[model samples]
Structures are given as C-alpha cells and as structure tokens.
Target: NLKVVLVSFKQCLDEKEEVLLDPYIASWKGLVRFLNSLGTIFSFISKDVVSKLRIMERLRGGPQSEHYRSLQAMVAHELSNRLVDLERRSHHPESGCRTVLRLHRALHWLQLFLEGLRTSPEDARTSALCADSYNASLAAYHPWVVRRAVTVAFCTLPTREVFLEAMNVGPPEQAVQMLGEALPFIQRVYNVSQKLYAEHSLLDLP
Candidate 1:
C-alpha cells in the first residue's frame, strides 16, 4: 500500500516540473491526473485529517470559530491543543491503545516507505516492498483503526498491470515516462523547502 502510494507520488513529484516546460503538457496532464487520483490516501498519517476534511465541508462559507480560518487550521489547532489528551481520549483504559502516538509513528513510516522507493532494486516487488516497509515502520505503532485500514489497502492494492491501465500509461512504460517528467518538479519543491528550513541535506535511501 505504501509503496504504491510513494512510487506514484514520487513520480508525480518528478513530473510536476516538466509540466512547466513547453513540451511537457501532455506528460503533465497524465501525472497530474494520477496524483489527483490519490486524493487523501497519503495526506497525513492520521486518519483524522481525512475526517476533518469531510466534516468541515459543511462548516464552510461561514465563520465557525475565531481562531480557525479553514478546516485544516481548525484541525491543526485541535491536534495541537489536544495533543496532551489525545492519548487519553484514544487509549482510555478500556481501549489501552495510544492513537495519537500511532498517527505520529505512522508519519515516520511514510517517510521510510518513500526512502525504500528511492533505493529499491529494479526487480523489487512493489507489494512486497510496501508490506516490508509498512511492517518495519508503522505497523507496530498502528492502532486498530489505522492497522485495519492499512491492511485492507495492501490487500486490495491494484496489480501492476491494472494500475498502469488505470493511469492510461501502458504498463510501466508510460508510467515511467510520466515519472521521469514529474520528478524534477517534486525535487524542486523539496530543494526549496530544505533551503528555507536551512536543512543540511535532503532525506534519501541508500
């Protein structure tokens, strides 16, 4: 599940910049559509973000709160303000599991999964790689909710062939072309971010 998401996004990151070039419009469309298809799949490790997006849609077009300007702002504020009690709320003695921590830990898993994509061997099975990365990074931290969802995604992951067809990029060939086009864009964004943060180096896998 993670690998499928990362490879698709990594490819999107690569292609976004190419779209800016005069000759890459078609390539850009393909990549953009593919990325858009991911929807909220990889928005954040927390499933709460997904819920917030949906729930807040109804609260839009009017002043809901003084401190929140948007659903994201509201969620962030709540997430931060409630951080102290999140574990308590989620892992009440009856539940005996920490959801807040689970979400944070899962974010780290996403990072690791992405790194795996960067370093994986060409013949590596994406499904196997995804499962390995998920198990090593986030699976243990996952509460029942996240664990079940993630497991289902892995179980239902589209085959390499179906994914290519859905993306309209013949098997892996077209997907590869689209990826080659978009990677530079993603890199550019990452570079700009690291520079702004004064980070010494970008994260990557061996």
Candidate 2:
C-alpha cells in the first residue's frame, strides 16, 4: 500500500510558494501508484506520466541543478538566463520549463478526474467522469486528433467499484471517504501551480 502525502504536498506548497523537485516527483509517483491500482486500462496514461517524472528526476540529479530544486527557482533561472522559449521553440528543446509544463498540464487533468471520482454516484459512468475531466482540463491543450484518441481511451475505464478497490484503502465507501478527505489538498496544489504558471506567463509554452 502506498502511503500518500497528498496533503503534505499541498501544505508544503502553501507554506512556501516554491516546491522542491523531490517532493514534486514524489507526489506524482504516489499518484501513479493510485493510477496503477486502476488496472491495465490506465497503463498507457500512467506510462506517459511516469516518463515525464523520470525526466525531471534526471535533470534534478545532473550537475549545476540547484535551480531545478524548486519550480520557482527553475522559472527564475530560465527566465533570467534566457533559457526559455517564450513564444516558440528556437533551439532550447529540452528546456526545463517546457518539460515541467507538460507534467503540470497533466496534473490538472488528474486533479479534476479525482474530484469527479470523489463525488460521482456509485453507479455513475467512470468513462464519462474521465472524459469530462479530460475535456475540461487537458483537452484544451491537446490537438484535435489527440483529443479524439483520448476519448476512445477513456471508454476503457474500469467500473467505480474496481477503481475504489484499487485505491487499496478498503471498501468502495471507504475509498470514497478517503478521496473526500484528500481531494481538497490536490485541488489547492493545482490552484497554486496554475496561479504560478499564469503569473509567469508560462502557461502556454511552445
């Protein structure tokens, strides 16, 4: 069973406007564990998310990586040093801001999906919850063809019972209870990140 620190992550971000790469990666790792419990149908999504997290991990471990330590610091470093492509990519392909932005977009989708899951009726369609979540958050950033493909993938989501069971917190009701407890923290963290990105004018990266 994965011991999740969803609230702790929120508190840390709230305490300081900046978040360290280690905890940022750990939060997603915990989320990936939750996604794993959802079963193989979600493996494709989890795989992509995990790959992005690993990219951050590698960057953080590299030399002269102090700026990568916090999201705020990374933005400060990239902008002050002129390492970012504000409008479009010129030459800096693996730019840290752009890379982390991808994960940040996905994080919004995850937060919305879990919020939907927390409130959905026991017999509600998981596919609809997932589709609605994606459409509202990630779909805006994705291309038309990718949106169509994502809708198709969402159709394969497991039932609510299965999703709750995979949470591994206990029964369906218990899992829902847990979600109720944890979702606010997730939402807060998402809101904080959203505000940060918007302030930096980095929300729509090329």
Candidate 3:
C-alpha cells in the first residue's frame, strides 16, 4: 500500500508542526520507490531527482544540524548569511534552500498528479492527466528536449486502473479514497513552502 509513503509524509510535520528534514527526505525516498515500480522510463529524471535527494540528506547530517531541522529554520540560516542567490552562486553552492527547491517543484507536480488521479474518469489516460499537471507546474523549468522527451514517454505510462492498483489499497476506489484523505497534508506542506520561497524570491534559484 501507499501507507508507508503517506506516513513518512505525515511525519514531515513536527510537534511544533513545522516540516522536518529527515521525514521530508523520507517521503521522497518513498516516492522514488513508487516511480521505480512504474518502470525505467522515469529513470531519465529519476537519477536527477535522486541526486538532489542525497544533497539534502547530506546537508541534514552535515554541520549546523539544528538549522537544518526545518525548512523555515534552514531558510533563515541560509538566507540571512546570503547562502542563496540568483546568478552569483558563489558561496554555499549546495545550500539547503536551493536543493530543496528542486524537490519542492516536483512536489507541486506530484500533488497535482495525485489529485487528478483521485478525481479522473475510471478509464482516463494517465499520460494526459500527468501531462496536464506537468505543463501546469514543471514544464516552465525543463528545456525543450526534456519536455518533448517526457511528453513522448508519457504514452508508455500504465493505465489509470493499473496505476491505482500499484498503491495496493484494496481497490482503485479505495486508493482514491486514501489519496483524498492523505493529500491535504501534502497540500498544507506545499503551501507553507511555496509562500516562504516566494516571500524571499527564491522560487527560481539557479
């Protein structure tokens, strides 16, 4: 089932309700498994996404572990000392802020994808659904080649029923039900992150 991934994501919210780095990293690992189950087509970007995952995991275990506890904390430490930048990415090249932004953008694409799957027609083409969500959020960043390649590969995606069954949630309807109950947590986390980055103009970090 998607229980493990969903629980990992839930743990991302701390006692004080801030998002935690370890669990945030944990959730993405679960997503990687989901993608792996889908097949090798995603490996084109999967390795890219996995590399970013390790970057954050490293930052979490490296020095200044306290500041890396939460995204809010991480941003404050990184931003105050000018660790993040637009084009002059001189110091702290692998700063936590920019590293997380890559996953943040992907999170947007994923949340949109899951939400669509929950509400789409039973026989809907998952490729079309995913493409719509990708265009809505991620297409702006990927260059022409990657974008064209991704769209072409979407045709290879499994059917909506197959996609739902992968969740192992008993039935496709139950999978949608599980997603319905689970995604608001993701929505909450994404909203907080989006606002913080936008407030600091860090949404399009280089």
Candidate 4:
C-alpha cells in the first residue's frame, strides 16, 4: 500500500543502495505528492521543486549517468572537473551538484516545518510555523523579492483544522498521531543529506 504520505519518503531512504539518484528522486516525488494533497495554495512551492528534481532526473538518465549515480559520486566527479559554482557565481548553473543543492535546501525547510507541525498545539497557526521554518532554512538562499513573496504566500495557508485533515490520515487527531510516527524518518533523511552536503562543501552551491 504505497499511500501518499511521509512514510513514502522513509521507504525510499530505507532501500537506498549507495544513494543512487533514482531513490533520491523517489524520495522527493513522495514529498511532491504530499504537497499536492495540501491543495492549490502549495502549487507554487511544489511546482518549482518538481522542476529542480526533473533537472537531476535528466542528469541521472543522461550520458554521464555514472557520475550522478550517487551524491558522493556526483560531488567527486563535478568537483574534480570544476563543474560546480561554489561561490554563488552561477557559472555552471546546471551542474548536478548545484541542482541537488536546491532540492537539499528545500528539504530542510520541509523537515523543519513538518517537525514544527508535528509538535505544535491544535490551536497553533500553520502560517507562522511555515514562515519560521522557511526563515530558518530556505530564506537565506532566496533573494529579497523571492523571500518576501514566499512569506506572503505563507499567510494564505489553510487553517490548522483543515491542514491536518488534508493529510489523509483518517482525521485531524489521527493525522497528528501519524506525523509523530513519521517525522523522525523525515528528520533522519534530512540529516543524512545535510551531512553529505556539509562534508562535500556543497551546501553553499550557487
């Protein structure tokens, strides 16, 4: 039963055999599905993320497939050949390292926001939670205009009542219970990615 839920990402991570690009895309695809269930308000966010994921997907299936077989492989290949723009120069804009970094930064936002939602009180505000998460993770990478626009979008989020119900985990309370069980997996996946990026000095990719 491959339901559209956080567990889908967990499953992708669990079966990882050398951090192949296929499983990386599978993990984000699960998140894209989860975002879709959140409703139209999140379309802007997911659409952009899906575009980045597709870029990596193309590289994985392209002639340089072996280079992108895993994060370590991609970094080693790209770094050796000077394909990445580590100082925000945007020279090799389409490099797989840069492409995956975008997704990586966004994943941190998702992890932090979901972790926030999982622990927030029933009366807590979803917009505030999302903004705080964004500020802590994705906001630094975004330009002023983009950051302002994204935070403004956050203000239009559905109520916490509707937000939890949209998770499709039976009901709001059950949904919260499910998040309690599911978020640690998301955090673990995020941590693994973070460690990989940090060690490779790829976290600040342009």
Candidate 5:
C-alpha cells in the first residue's frame, strides 16, 4: 500500500494555500518528460482518447528548451482554439477537454502534493493528499467530462511506494530541487495559456 497523506476536510482546505507555496514544488517537473513520453505510449493505448502530447521534436539540444514546451504548446493551441479533438483525433465528433490541459493540470496537482509530502509526516497518506490537492486546485477548472476522466486517472495512479520508486524520490531531496527549478517554467506556460483561454471563456461547453 502507498503511504498517502491524510488530512481532515477542514485542515486539508486550510492547509492548501500553504501547501501551494511550499519550496519543494519543483520536484514534479521532471515527471513532465517522463509523462510526455508516456503520452506517446499511452496515447496509443487510449487510442488517443486521452489528451495529446504536444511538442514536435527537440530543438538543437540547448538550454532553455525542454520537452514540456511542446506539450504546453500543443495544449495551448488546442484549448485556445477549443479543439478538444486534438488529443485523440480518433475519439472525435465528441470533443472534450484538451489532453494538454489534462497533462498540465495533473502536473499542477502532482507538484502541489509532492511539496506537501516533503515536510509532511512519514505517516502521511499519499493517495489522500494527492486527491485533496487535485480537488482543491485543478478540479474547479475542469469541466464535467474532464472531471470524470481525471477521476478515473487518479484512481489508477500508482501507490506512493511505486510512485516514489518509479520517480526515484526516496531521498526526495534532489526531486524537491528539481521541481523548484522546473515547475515554474511549466507554470509560466500554463498561466499564460490559462489567461488566453479564460479571456475567451474556453470553459464554455462547445
């Protein structure tokens, strides 16, 4: 069983703002590459039902250029244009949220939850913590269709032990630093796109 962070409804709600600002938030950014890769493999399995991973190819392999941008761009364009079919063109005729949004939103949740864990008790329940963070932060932005999809994805997420092992966050120190540095870049992109989408009310059920 994964060790999840458990909190009361009130405490979880109250602690959320502090949890949002934790210094360890950057750790989850590394997973962007990892998940973007999964976007490729998983994309096939879902038959593109999930969000599409944006990003064409790497730049000339330079600094200030990470793969997550491609993912971000892909989502931004789709969401901005209200093109939900972009994620899995095959699942089309019934478009929903952008896979890009889902990906970044998940990143947001993961980053927030991991920061909480950095200082949370060893007895913290990872599952509950993750769920709470997702609910508080990303859940409101997601439409009903996206909400259902996210719920299913969270249910299938790996346990804390498997997750820590997979991401190799046992020590979690380096992971924490990684997130602090990289997540902002992702957030920069996400924020800009969110503003663009919101300005147009991308939330409207098309």
Candidate 6:
C-alpha cells in the first residue's frame, strides 16, 4: 500500500508549485490504511489521523474552498481572518489552519520514521526506529502523558522486516528502494510547509 501512498503524495503537488489539498488528504488515507493493517497496535495513532484528515476534507468543499485548495492558500485565508487558534484549541479549534498544523507536525514524525526505516540495517527493531523518530519530532509537541503513551505504543510495533514487507513493495530491500524514491516527495511537502508556518509564526500554534 506504500505504492498507493506514494502515488497520492506524488500527486499532491501541482507540477512544481503548490501542494494540493485533495491529494494531500488522500495521501494520509493511504498511510492510515497501512497502519490499520498493523492491527490495533497503531489504532490510537490512526484514530488521530482520521480526525485530522476529516477536518481538512470538510474544508475542501465548504465555503471559501478556493482558499482551501492549497496549503499556502489555506494558511493565507485562515490567518487573514483570525480563524486560527494561535494559543490553544478553545475557539476556532476546527479551523483549517490548526487542523493542517497538527498533521503538519505529525508529518515531520512520519518522515523521520520512514527515513529511519529506509536506512536501518537488516533485522532492525521498528520500536526503536519509531521511538527515536518520534522523540526527534512530534514528541516535542506532546504532553508527558501522551508522550509516555505513544512511546509505549510504539514499543509494540512489528519488527523492521515485517513492517517493510507489509508495505507490499515486493520485499524489504525493494521497499527500502521505494522509500528512497518516495521520501523526498514527503520531504518537499514538509519543507514547504515548514517555511510557510515559520514565516507566519504559526509553528508554535497550540
């Protein structure tokens, strides 16, 4: 299903310009499907994934969708109108800006995890790779309770070999190869969003 994930992320950008919201949301669906295949081990994470994607998808067809068409557009629209909750998720909790910001930060952890998977030696432990990746990125944004819970949850991940093979990319070796190709697409998207958020001072959004 990494191929489907790859295809979705590959289609997310418009030629050389913006990241389209449609395929961007579709990309997460493909990813959540892969996680769901891991049984209940990742159910908590995937549930969070569903809620974030659900919020974004709803924005895609609601009023002012033209602004919601691209990440850049949505950020502009939300900030301009003060729809974003820059401090906490009290008022405007469901705003498109903050919803994307949640996934935007999580996407960092995803890229780190995947890159770790791609570079690890044979028979690596997914738990360690996942934990380290989480620690490096999203863990900073989480509370202590969530942090302990997530690290504990990650410890139950399948072994590296099993997890990669589950990607349906032939074998672990081939999966690594495909990951090499697909990861930069994710990197590009992340970098673009990082710069956008940093410029707008939205990276610290609560």
Best by TM-score: 6
**lDDT of candidate 1 at residue 148, scale 0 to 100:** 68
- Cα lDDT, all candidates: 0.40, 0.79, 0.85, 0.79, 0.43, 0.85
Off by over 4 Å in 6: none
Query: How well does candidate 6 score on lDDT at residue 115?
Result: 96
- Higher-scoring candidate on TM-score, 4 or 5: 4
Question: 25-108, model 2: which lDDT tens digit per residue?
Answer: 888888787777665767666898898888788888888489888888888988889888988878876788888888888888
Task: Candidate 5: count the clashes.
Answer: 13
Model 6, 51-142: lDDT tens digits are: 88998888887888799999889988999898988887688978887788888888898899999999999867899999999989988889
lDDT of 3 by residue, 1-206 (tens): 67568666778877777878888888888888787777688766678778988988777778888889899999999889778866756766778888899899998998999899999998799999999999999999889998998898788889998898889887788899999888887887788789888998898887
Worst 10 residues of 3 by lDDT: 85-94
- Which pairs clash inside model 4? none
Q: Give candidate 5 regions above 4 Å deviation.
A: 1-51, 54-104, 138-162
Rank order (by TM-score, best first): 6, 3, 2, 4, 5, 1
Q: What tens-digit string does per-residue lDDT give for candidate 5 at 125-178? A: 665666778787778876798666756555545445454455544444554444
* Candidate 6 lDDT for residue 136: 93
Candidates' RMSD to native: 10.5, 2.0, 1.5, 2.2, 11.3, 1.4
Ten contiguous residues minimizing lDDT sum, candidate 6: 1-10
Q: Candidate 2, 117: how far from true, in Å?
A: 1.3
Candidate 2 overall lDDT versus native: 0.79
Q: Write the per-residue lDDT of candidate 1 for residues 137-197, one digit (tens) a residue.
A: 6676557897767665664444444543455445555555554553444444334323422
**lDDT score at residue 152, model 4, on the 0-100 scale:** 74
Return the TM-score for candidate 1, rounded to 2 decimals: 0.41
